Amino acid sequence: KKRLERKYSKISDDYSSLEQVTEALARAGLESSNLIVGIDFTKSNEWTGARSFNRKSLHFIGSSPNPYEQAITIIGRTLAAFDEDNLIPCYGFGDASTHDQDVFSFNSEDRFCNGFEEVLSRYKEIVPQLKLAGPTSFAPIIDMAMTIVEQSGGQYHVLVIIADGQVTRSVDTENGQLSPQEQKTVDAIVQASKLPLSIVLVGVGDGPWDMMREFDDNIPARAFDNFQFVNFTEIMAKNKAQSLKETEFALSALMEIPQQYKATIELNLLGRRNGYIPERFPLPPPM
Ligand SMILES: [Ca+2]
Ligand SMILES: [Ca+2]
Ligand SMILES: [Ca+2]
Ligand SMILES: [Mg+2]
């Protein structure tokens, strides 16, 4: 077990096209996957639109779609295939109703969204009724994903977190001493490597991204690299045509999935219950 974890320590970008990954996924023997979506409704979204979204809030409802609406739309166009039943569990976190402690379900009895159509539909209905708040932690959304996976009896899931990457940090700490939010988020990423769960951070807005890269590349304590960072605004910024960016997004999202899936098998997680994952209950959507 010691040697198999240092085999899956860090996962580089080992694929230059979507086709290479699609093939690597076949060769890996991936037959069934499900998506979970988490959306950052923290107040940082108010100022992380400075350069990338014209001094507006990333959650601003205008005449054209905001980076959250864009990401939901492009995830639906590129990854909807990887949810086998097209029912998407969708959760908000970091509004006044949840802060850094909970998540809320997009629909009432934690009814899953009917495709990315309803994820987008509901995002629009929900965000104007929210108070963007904080602090910012991924612990609750990762716990929610862990609970979904555990209750499924270890079915492979991909948690897609759309976020501005601004997790609460000690602005003056000189060494690498961690905020409570960082610490709990890291503990959650570590806990989640006991389960057949892949995480993909779809970054929107200006960054900075130092911490999302830390989560991507450098968490020694975890059983396998279960975290990919995708700079979605860097990709959409580029000069090339729309469909050529959609492809680059898809490649970047799926980049770590082949080795991650293999890890769930080699580490004896796929189709197993861990047994000791405390059940998390999502709050209802704000009304
Ligand atoms: Ca599903
Ligand atoms: Ca990684
Ligand atoms: Ca990576
Ligand atoms: Mg925040």
Place of tokens 């350069």: 51
Method: X-ray
SS3 45: helix
CB atoms within 10 A of CB 282: 23
Q: Which ligand is nearest to the CA of 217?
A: 2
Resolution in units of Å: 2.8
* Domain 2-8+39-167+180-266 fold: Rossmann fold (3.40.50)
Written in H, E and C, the secondary structure of 248-263 is HHHHHHHCCHHHHHHH
Distance CA 197, CA 24 (A): 18
Helix (H) or strand (E) holding 198: strand 197-203
Q: Which two tokens stand for residue 131?
A: 């108070």
Question: One-letter amino acid identity for 120?
Answer: L
Q: Which ligand is nearest to the CA of 157?
A: 1
Residue pair 273/154 in contact by the 8 Å Cβ criterion: yes
Distance CA 263, CA 93 (A): 29
- Residue 262 phi, psi (nearest 5): -50, -45
Distance CA 108, CA 211 (A): 33
Question: One-letter amino acid identity for 95?
Answer: D
Question: DSSP character for 222?
Answer: S
Question: DSSP character for 46?
Answer: G
Place of tokens 């492809």: 247
Residue pair 268/34 in contact by the 8 Å Cβ criterion: no
Distance CA 201, CA 221 (A): 19
Distance CA 183, CA 60 (A): 30
Place of tokens 């997009």: 106
- Name which of 64, 39, 206, 207 is nearest 127 in CA terms: 39
Distance CA 287, CA 9 (A): 43
Alpha carbon of 84 to ligand 1 centroid (Å): 6
Each domain of the chain, given as residue ranges in start order, spans: 2-8+39-167+180-266
Alpha carbon of 254 to ligand 3 centroid (Å): 10
Q: Which ligand is nearest to the CA of 90?
A: 1
Distance CA 71, CA 3 (A): 37
Residue pair 171/124 in contact by the 8 Å Cβ criterion: no
Q: Which ligand is nearest to the CA of 87?
A: 1
Order of all β-strands in the sheet with 34-40 = 104-105, 90-93, 34-40, 157-163, 197-203, 227-231
Alpha carbon of 170 to ligand 1 centroid (Å): 37
Place of tokens 């990954």: 21
Q: Which ligand is nearest to the CA of 34?
A: 1
Helix (H) or strand (E) holding 2: helix 2-7
Distance CA 64, CA 82 (A): 28
Distance CA 79, CA 58 (A): 22
- Name which of 251, 211, 206, 241 is nearest 67 in CA terms: 206
Residue pair 205/233 in contact by the 8 Å Cβ criterion: yes
Question: DSSP character for 38?
Answer: E
